[PDB]
């Protein structure tokens, strides 16, 4: 980042005085391992059943879908702080709840995260969702030069926004001849940015996230794979594994509003 301007008046013919420069900042994240296991007895694969030819493939497909859902939840489901792996303790991811601390807002008696990813702070008292939070977040993003253009939140907050938002309005009129009734709010505009609002099934409740998709990355240390375990009897065992990490390019480009309740 750059430095704040100052007086900078200087004196004519002066011997040059050296001014200190600016240095970069280091950030890092750890890796996480996810897995899923399955065991099916031999006799269950031979009996005739309705809708399935082989039970193993059915269960394996369901487990793979659940593993992808687990990866998404680990990404955005709940706050998470980085933990260094050890021979007795698991290694943990640092998600978005442990990085964004500048342009966001927190409830009363709440503490912001440090910013390195080692902690996520403490939650505050819930408050009603107002447009002032969105306006302040957009202004803060604009001040820091961010280019966020996407908004994601839980289904309840999306429902609350669509039902009663009335941005800079007081009437909300509808023609009597119109035969269609719609409750849909997707695009938010202001002097500082343009955003599209979308709902996420697995998003953490009482949270809103304004972000630029290009400033986040998911890095695979080991791409998702699977293998079969050792045969020790009349059953078959399978396992699937993946190893991943998450990188946030710059915290200043987004905002995270927490402890916001919808529909009172």
């Amino acid at each position: 980042e750059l430095r704040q301007p100052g007086k900078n008046t200087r004196v004519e013919g002066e011997d040059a005085t050296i001014k200190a420069g600016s240095f970069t900042t280091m950030l890092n994240n750890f890796c996480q391992i996810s897995d899923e296991t399955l065991q099916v007895t031999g006799t269950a694969d031979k009996v005739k059943k309705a809708g399935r030819k082989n039970e193993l493939a059915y269960q394996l497909a369901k487990k793979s879908k659940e593993l992808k859902l687990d990866m998404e939840y680990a990404m955005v489901g709940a706050p998470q702080a980085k933990i260094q792996r050890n021979t007795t303790t698991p290694g943990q991811m640092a998600n978005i709840f442990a990085y964004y601390k500048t342009n966001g807002s927190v409830g009363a008696n709440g503490t912001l995260p440090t910013g390195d990813g080692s902690d996520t702070g403490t939650a505050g008292d819930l408050r009603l969702l107002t447009e002032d939070m969105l306006l302040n977040a957009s202004e803060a993003i604009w001040r820091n030069g961010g280019q966020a253009n996407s908004i994601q939140t839980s289904s309840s907050i999306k429902k609350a926004i669509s039902k009663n938002m009335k941005g800079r309005a007081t009437e909300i009129t509808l023609d009597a001849s119109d035969n269609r009734i719609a409750q849909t709010v997707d695009v938010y505009e202001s002097d500082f940015g343009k955003y599209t609002i979308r709902a996420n099934r697995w998003f953490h409740e009482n949270t809103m996230f304004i972000f630029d998709p290009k400033m986040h990355a998911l890095c695979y240390l080991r791409p998702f794979f699977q293998h079969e375990l050792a045969k020790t009897g009349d059953s078959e065992k399978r396992q699937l594994l993946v190893e991943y990490t998450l990188r946030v390019n710059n915290e200043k480009s987004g905002a995270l509003i927490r402890d916001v309740v919808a529909q009172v």
Partner: protein, 53 residues
């Protein structure tokens, strides 16, 4: 949480090459709207003066 006892893991072996991406992320803004709006001119002395009526 077993991490079998004599298994060679990331803890034991040494010489892991560090990974550091070659991109530096800077989005600090730098614009001077007032400089662009106002006009430009040339001064030829320490003191620059004009008149109004």
């Amino acid at each position: 949480m077993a991490t079998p006892t004599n298994a060679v893991s990331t803890v034991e072996i040494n010489g892991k090459r560090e990974d550091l991406i070659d991109i530096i992320y800077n989005i600090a803004p730098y614009d001077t709207p007032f400089m662009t709006a106002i006009g430009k001119g040339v001064a030829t002395a320490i003191t620059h003066e004009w008149q109004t009526d």
